[PDB]
Amino acid sequence: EVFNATRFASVYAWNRTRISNCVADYSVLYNFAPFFAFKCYGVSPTKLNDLCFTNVYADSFVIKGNEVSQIAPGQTGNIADYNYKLPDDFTGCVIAW
Amino acid sequence: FKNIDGYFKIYSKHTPIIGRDFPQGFSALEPLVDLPIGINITRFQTLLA
Amino acid sequence: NSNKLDSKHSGNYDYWYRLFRKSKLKPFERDISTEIYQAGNKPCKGKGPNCYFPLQSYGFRPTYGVGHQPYRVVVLSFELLHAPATVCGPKKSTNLVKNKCVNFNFNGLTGTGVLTKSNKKFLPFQQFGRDIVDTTDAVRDPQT
Amino acid sequence: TTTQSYTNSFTRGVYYPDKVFRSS
Numbered sequence A: 001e002v003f004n005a006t007r008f009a010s011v012y013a014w015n016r017t018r019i020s021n022c023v024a025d026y027s028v029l030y031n032f033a034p035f036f037a038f039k040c041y042g043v044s045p046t047k048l049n050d051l052c053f054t055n056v057y058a059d060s061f062v063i064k065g066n067e068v069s070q071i072a073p074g075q076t077g078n079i080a081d082y083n084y085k086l087p088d089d090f091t092g093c094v095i096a097w
Numbered sequence B: 001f002k003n004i005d006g007y008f009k010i011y012s013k014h015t016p017i018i019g020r021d022f023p024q025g026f027s028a029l030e031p032l033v034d035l036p037i038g039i040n041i042t043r044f045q046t047l048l049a
Numbered sequence C: 001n002s003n004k005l006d007s008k009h010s011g012n013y014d015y016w017y018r019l020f021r022k023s024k025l026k027p028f029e030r031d032i033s034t035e036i037y038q039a040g041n042k043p044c045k046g047k048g049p050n051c052y053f054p055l056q057s058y059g060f061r062p063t064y065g066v067g068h069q070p071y072r073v074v075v076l077s078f079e080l081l082h083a084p085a086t087v088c089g090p091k092k093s094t095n096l097v098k099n100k101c102v103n104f105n106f107n108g109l110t111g112t113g114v115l116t117k118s119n120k121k122f123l124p125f126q127q128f129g130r131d132i133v134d135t136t137d138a139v140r141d142p143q144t
Numbered sequence D: 001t002t003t004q005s006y007t008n009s010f011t012r013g014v015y016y017p018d019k020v021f022r023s024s
């Protein structure tokens, strides 16, 4: 439901769906879309279904190709400093399709 | 040979035995060297003369 | 903490660390390799989707947290076993006395007893010695 | 080129596990 909406809010409305009392089924995360950026920094993208979390935050954005690579810890630009800043100590994964 | 927690071991004993083949009489096996390699080993080949 | 060797202006990401290994690491085994980590299904000889580089940069850039500073950690592995020693500390060289009840600290093995020349057959690699029941019985003189 | 003949190990391959002297 969060990866198949119709009006994913852009960078000015980070549009977060908080995750609790869920099941972390990441098979959909793999088979869904051909993908273009699947960078994981703090958590492995395969050794993660064995980890249990308290809450998970997913922010759905709409940007261009350059901004897709721009979204990264410790980065500057029109989207990494003025609209949405990624923390340096961020542990998680990014999805871009 | 073995490399448990590194430490390659070579135990040796030389005897000009009857010489038919791999014999049957028991023999002890004295160590020669003990070197703590601390590397990873998986295969085994040999050089010739 | 080593802030004066692993930090510099404008950042420093020289160091590296692994998070993607095909299995758990056995003790004291190095797995240094730049083999691209493809979980996926496809071969992925190169980079890209679901087939990523196994090791990431630690990102030890100056200071961004007390729990995130550049700590230098070194581990010292001793082997306290019955084997010929190589490293010691301060040494006293009191001359050996036999046929007398003495306290001995032979090569780290401490104890009390009486010593005498024996007629055993220690092989040059044998150091400690024992008796029937697993106790230090005869220690060959490392000097003479 | 070498052969790959199979033989029985019989009783063999026992070394000294440690550097500790023993008798009887």
Ligand SMILES: *[C@@H]1O[C@H](CO)[C@@H](O)[C@H](O)[C@H]1NC(C)=O
Binding pocket: A004
């Ligand atoms: C979104 O859902 C509809 C029906 O629920 C489905 O037909 C469509 O394929 C879905 N979108 C994607 C990208 O799978």
Ligand SMILES: *[C@@H]1O[C@H](CO)[C@@H](O)[C@H](O)[C@H]1NC(C)=O
Binding pocket: B040, B041, B042, C023, C025, C026, C027, C028, C029, C030, C031
């Ligand atoms: C050593 O290599 C084998 C295969 O080459 C591998 O299975 C094992 O995990 C490695 N161990 C270490 C400590 O590198």
Ligand SMILES: *[C@@H]1O[C@H](CO)[C@@H](O)[C@H](O)[C@H]1NC(C)=O
Binding pocket: C142, C143, C144
């Ligand atoms: C000094 O050490 C060497 C090393 O074996 C040996 O000659 C002996 O243990 C010592 N020399 C003496 C006590 O004169």
